[PDB]
Write a protein that binds this ligand. Sequence first.
Ligand SMILES: O=C(Nc1cccc(C(=O)Nc2ccc(S(=O)(=O)O)c3cc(S(=O)(=O)O)cc(S(=O)(=O)O)c23)c1)Nc1cccc(C(=O)Nc2ccc(S(=O)(=O)O)c3cc(S(=O)(=O)O)cc(S(=O)(=O)O)c23)c1
Ligand SMILES: [Zn+2]
Ligand SMILES: [Zn+2]
Lengths: 77, 78
Amino acid sequence: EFVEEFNRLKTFANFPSGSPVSASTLARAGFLYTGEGDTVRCFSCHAAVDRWQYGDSAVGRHRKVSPNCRFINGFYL
Amino acid sequence: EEFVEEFNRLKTFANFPSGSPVSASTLARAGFLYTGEGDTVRCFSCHAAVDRWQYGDSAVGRHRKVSPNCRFINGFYL
Ligand SMILES: O=C(Nc1cccc(C(=O)Nc2ccc(S(=O)(=O)O)c3cc(S(=O)(=O)O)cc(S(=O)(=O)O)c23)c1)Nc1cccc(C(=O)Nc2ccc(S(=O)(=O)O)c3cc(S(=O)(=O)O)cc(S(=O)(=O)O)c23)c1
Ligand SMILES: [Zn+2]
Ligand SMILES: [Zn+2]
């Protein structure tokens, strides 16, 4: 369902174009856009991450908050 | 586990940045433990990791945003 990158990238309507991390990178890192600020939420682990700066790795920050996430550990590949 | 008591979460805040916009007691009261890196904290219940704290932040408000279904935040611990 949200296993498809493309469907996750559909949730990034109205995501801020100002953000230093693109919607594309985020969706590839397993995230959906919450529709509030730059807060994104993983479709698998349901954990969220916010406050993106220049140079963040979306995958890195995702591993940091949920090192045991199925997405991040390659369950869906 | 043992981190249900606020005082036990407060004990994990050794070496927390003195300059933090949000104090250790505010964070421990919001359910958080200090991971020992930067200003990164982690809820004992829902495992949400939060960092980059700024003036204006509510520790509980940010907690709820990242994990609206967190057991701790919804009073599951009496
Ligand atoms: O836990 C969560 N998430 C979580 C938790 C609580 C609430 C919410 C929440 O708010 N949910 C929702 C919000 C919004 C929406 S939405 O707005 O609707 O879109 C939701 C929609 C739906 S729906 O399905 O689409 O309807 C469903 C949910 S929901 O999640 O179902 O409710 C939603 C989310 N994820 C997770 C998953 C997998 C692995 C890990 C992981 O890595 N854990 C760990 C990390 C680090 C450490 S560390 O301390 O060692 O570093 C860990 C230590 C230990 S320890 O050694 O045992 O102490 C144990 C773990 S453990 O967890 O691995 O056991 C650790 C974490
Ligand atoms: Zn995840
Ligand atoms: Zn929590």
